[PDB]
Amino acid sequence: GLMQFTLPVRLCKEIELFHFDIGPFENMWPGIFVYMVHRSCGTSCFELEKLCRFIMSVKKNYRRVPYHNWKHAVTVAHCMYAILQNNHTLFTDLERKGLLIACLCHDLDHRGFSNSYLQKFDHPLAALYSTSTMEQHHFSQTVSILQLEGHNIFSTLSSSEYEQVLEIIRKAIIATDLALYFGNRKQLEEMYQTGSLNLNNQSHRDRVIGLMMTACDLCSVTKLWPVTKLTANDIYAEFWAEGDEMKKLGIQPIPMMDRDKKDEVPQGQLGFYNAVAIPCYTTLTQILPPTEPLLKACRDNLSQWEKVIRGEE
Numbered sequence: 001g002l003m004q005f006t007l008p009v010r011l012c013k014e015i016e017l018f019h020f021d022i023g024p025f026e027n028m029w030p031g032i033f034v035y036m037v038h039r040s041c042g043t044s045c046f047e048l049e050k051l052c053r054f055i056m057s058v059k060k061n062y063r064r065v066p067y068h069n070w071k072h073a074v075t076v077a078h079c080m081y082a083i084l085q086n087n088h089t090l091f092t093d094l095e096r097k098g099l100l101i102a103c104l105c106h107d108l109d110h111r112g113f114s115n116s117y118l119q120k121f122d123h124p125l126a127a128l129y130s131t132s133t134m135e136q137h138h139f140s141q142t143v144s145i146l147q148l149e150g151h152n153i154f155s156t157l158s159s160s161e162y163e164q165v166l167e168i169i170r171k172a173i174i175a176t177d178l179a180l181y182f183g184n185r186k187q188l189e190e191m192y193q194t195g196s197l198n199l200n201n202q203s204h205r206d207r208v209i210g211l212m213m214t215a216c217d218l219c220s221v222t223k224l225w226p227v228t229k230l231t232a233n234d235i236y237a238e239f240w241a242e243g244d245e246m247k248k249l250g251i252q253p254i255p256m257m258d259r260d261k262k263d264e265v266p267q268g269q270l271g272f273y274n275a276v277a278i279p280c281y282t283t284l285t286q287i288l289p290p291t292e293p294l295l296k297a298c299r300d301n302l303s304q305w306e307k308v309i310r311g312e313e
């Protein structure tokens, strides 16, 4: 009960900034997460014995894929931690509890392939879940780990609070399906502009938590240029592996997934920033002004990709 986690001074400070990189020392990532829960949520939120056992079971159910791995889970949780610490009073106790867990669990048992590839492969998960295929599986794996003896970190909630927290987690993890992001952002765009956006309307909060999830999930593009650029190799390692598996099923993949078209990555990253990432953090910054450092870092990285295209890197 009187047992804080405490990080070294450089991490104690930098962990508060949106652009913090959790480092290459895997054995520090559990303590980084517990640190973030204790400051976001309280030392009372979870039984440490149970939390520690839930964290290690979650870690074990992430695979050693180049991008959708345990490091991504912890990175996406740290971005959520930063959004919550910069928007103290906008979020319920339950919401802070559920969102840090949802971010940690959001890509559980990812295999490094998209929903599209599962459907073209005719994977069993595509018969069980016809839309948001991986995301419905990530939520399923979250509930399975919650039900392991010793792992129920929510056991001290009332029955109704327990149902609300699992419902926050389920919607948060489904919202990480980027196919749903485009419509969720448009609707938040219209509601903010026409002035109907109302954070006491549950269906409105849901949409806002959905956009926060998309912002956390895409947060590679909000790091300092050297982090963003070196991790871009991890995401293309997966895309191009999926492209190779497309060609083995007799299907030309899209260019993003075709390693023969590596040359056009710079222009492909431009599209992504322009069509997805900049719109995401713009609409987030309109709803939650203290998240503006994410939009500023995203814009800095777009401008670094523009320099790549102009032959200056």
Ligand SMILES: Cn1ncc(C(=O)NCc2cc[nH]n2)c1C(=O)Nc1ccn2cc(-c3ccccc3)nc2n1
Residues within 6 Å of the ligand: 178, 218, 220, 221, 227, 228, 229, 230, 231, 232, 233, 235, 255, 256, 257, 261, 262, 263, 264, 265, 266, 267, 268, 269, 271, 272
């Ligand atoms: C979903 N998702 N999640 C994260 C990212 C990502 O690219 N994140 C940046 C990142 C990750 C780490 N550092 N930077 C994306 C994404 O769809 N990107 C994308 C989206 C569209 N494209 C198109 C091309 C491309 C490349 C070569 C030739 C032709 C076209 N290239 C892309 N790339």
Ligand SMILES: [Mg+2]
Residues within 6 Å of the ligand: 106, 107, 134, 176, 177
């Ligand atoms: Mg995912």
Ligand SMILES: [Zn+2]
Residues within 6 Å of the ligand: 072, 076, 106, 107, 176, 217
């Ligand atoms: Zn993810």
